[model samples]
Target: VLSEGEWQLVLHVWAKVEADVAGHGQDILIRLFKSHPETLEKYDRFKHLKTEAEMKASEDLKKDGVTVLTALGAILKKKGHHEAELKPLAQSHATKHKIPIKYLEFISEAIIHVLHSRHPGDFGADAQGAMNKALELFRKDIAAKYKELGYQG
Candidate 1:
């Protein structure tokens, strides 16, 4: 029961974090749920849903969401869009590329294909900047979800 209370606290923290990052005219939390519905399984309410069938559904939803979120973070960080607001994963690759192993991760899709352009360097900080906004959107949603699911935030 305390964990459930903890979970609510998590959601509160998530909400605050999201609000801080997605300051104006953004429905980022909604977008995250829309983008990855299957990740809802990580929630306790998901398990209590009808016939327990919905439980599996939420589990799948959460997993899918986390995957996309992680990928999105990487893409955003690679481009360097959100600076102080960047995800750890996104910043991980960006930091690495900026420092060493500068070949670029998921270079083609995150950059050339997504941006419809070409790379100008061994590393693409420009591309990273482009995805930074989108990545911030995901970050907002993820932090919210972390709260929604009783995560530690």
Candidate 2:
């Protein structure tokens, strides 16, 4: 649903933020956990990381955070072309991790918040809408994989 111009805007904005993706992703995860503590239970291995700094310090978080941004970066670069990159991630989250599919929705909202707060001057309705659509596509892919993995939800 992104226009070519909107796609370019999405790519440009993400490019500006990619360098700080790890930190920004950390913040997003913190916010998501704080807002929906139940979501944290999905990461039982990381229950020891009760604080933001602790989570940020965990190599697992850093690596997965970078993984997300790397996949997301490729997706943004092509605007729906590389969404298949999300399939394996989705399958893992749904099957092995047993993470509730809705976490995608939760994290997507957190992403909008992170983008708005980090790029206050640059973020606008258009960019917000574009990102929302992009994240919806992500959610769709994740949901599809979740269903394929036999998740009842």
Candidate 3:
């Protein structure tokens, strides 16, 4: 759904910014935890990580940030194919952990918010729209997978 210019801009901007993707991604997660203190409680694996110091000290925290950026990279690579790649994650979250759809949605919001904050000057209106569109499609794909698995609520 990105325009020609938007697509080019996304690639160009990402190329300029991807070098620090890990740090930026980690910041987003850190901000998420700070903003929604109760969010860490929702993650069973992270329930024991009560403080930011402990969470940051773990490689798992960094790995999760890498995972988020990787998904964003995959989503930006192709059209429907890469977008469809998120369904399995959705299924696992819905079936294996019963993660609420709301938290699933919160991920996209957090990313967008962080991107805007990180690149205040570079992430212009059209570019932000392009990112938002991709994230929305990603969210819808996950929600559809959840529904397909009969996780109604």
Candidate 4:
């Protein structure tokens, strides 16, 4: 659970990244793909891109980056009470996408990594813990939904 102070710190830092969600979001996704190349196979539109340069230049990947960040932005606005927003997304990922739960951890780390790379001072040690907790809760929520939906590893 996030304290009032932690929530404030996260939101304050998020606001800066949200201001340029497209750029930062794409960077996060690109970083994820670069780190875990096999994950790219999960996206049909991106799967055909064979190289890092191709991944970086793809318009489809950029749009997907925006879409993901926009959803996260909406969830963050709720500050920790985001079940209504998270439920549908969790359901879709479980039932439709069939994404492994472990990927959530990768994505969370990618988000933090990108945030830190982009805003070194703002996302230093103080804010890192708050951000990690926030993303951990988000991942747990999705994992719970996946279990409820009978999604097996």
Candidate 5:
């Protein structure tokens, strides 16, 4: 759980991200794919994309990015008490998507990278620290659900 000050700082940065969820989401995905190319293999919709140009033009990537960001936004808005909501998402990823739970850490890292790169002035060290704590909790919540769903990975 975020402390009061951390919540304030995270929400301040989140306001900017919420304004253009799709754009920031897409940017995060692009960063993730660039940094972790093997992660792309997890996404059937995007695994076929061979080049950066093709990735940029991928409509599926854009839509899925929106979905990912929207889910994160909801969790943020709830201030980390979204276990019920996370359960379904965890089940989908664990059972249907077959995405390794460890990938959530990569997504969290990409989110922080995107936030810092896009809003350096606002996302300073303090903001980054708060965001990291918040995301750590978020990842733990999802991990709990993944475990409950019987996902070993």
Candidate 6:
């Protein structure tokens, strides 16, 4: 059971998936088919062969965040978002691959601390303010990096 806000976020994430991959992922799918045939049917939320082996060992992702990431990838195909989503997924994959879940939990909780410290809102404007500040700071930092690299392209 999720709260309205959390539910909204989940739905937003799902909508991004449909708009990006199922609707606009054809080109990406083609490239993937050509380059990585082994992974050809990895994301077939639409499956042709439904078997016990396929269901048990392949064509399935155990991690819930993979669904979110797939959706976010589609969203980025339409328009970009922040890149923080990738790291968490990587850490989660590491957890799945034998890295301790406790470590992943600690890292995620630490990020939550940073976010809450910046906002400290009971789901109020304070969180929005912190987000605005963070976005502005991030934009400036990226600009500075590009400038330092003599970016003219």
| TM-scores for the candidates | 0.23, 0.86, 0.81, 0.94, 0.93, 0.25
Residue 83's lDDT within candidate 5 is: 82
In terms of TM-score, the best-performing candidate is: 4
Could you give me the TM-score of model 1 versus the true structure? 0.23
Better of 1 and 4 by lDDT: 4
Q: Which candidate order results from sorting by TM-score in descending order?
A: 4, 5, 2, 3, 6, 1
lDDT of 2 by residue, 35-85 (tens): 888887776567557777787788877776677777777777867775567
Instruction: Write the number of the candidate with greater TM-score, choosing between 3 and 4.
Output: 4
Question: TM-score of the candidate numbered 2?
Answer: 0.86
As for TM-score, the candidate ahead, 2 or 3, is 2
- Write candidate 1's Cα lDDT for 1-153 as tens digits: 123333333233333323333221122223323344443333454324443335334554345434444454443433333334434534433333231111222221232232222223312454344343343454454444344444433
Minimal lDDT window, size 10, model 1: 99-108
How are the candidates ranked when ordered by lDDT, highest leading? 4, 5, 2, 3, 6, 1
* lDDT (Cα, tens digit) per residue for candidate 5, span 30-92: 888888888988766678887777876888998988999888888887877788778888889
Which residue pairs collide, candidate 4?
Answer: none
Candidate 6 or 5, higher lDDT: 5
- The model with the greater TM-score, 5 or 6, is 5
**What tens digits encode model 3's per-residue C-alpha lDDT throughout 44-151?**
666677677887777778888888787777667664456357767777778987877677567767876877787867678887887777667666777777888898
Superposed Cα deviation of residue 149, candidate 1 (Å): 0.4
lDDT of 6 by residue, 35-131 (tens): 4344434444534434434433432322323453464444333222444543444433443333233333333333234334433443235433433
Candidate 1 whole-model C-alpha lDDT, 0 to 1: 0.35
Error of 3 at 94 (Å): 1.8
lDDT at position 3, candidate 3? 69
Candidate 5 lDDT for residue 80: 76
User: Candidate 6: lDDT of 11?
Assistant: 40
lDDT for each candidate structure: 0.35, 0.77, 0.72, 0.86, 0.85, 0.37
Q: What C-alpha lDDT, on a 0 to 100 scale, does residue 122 get in candidate 6?
A: 33
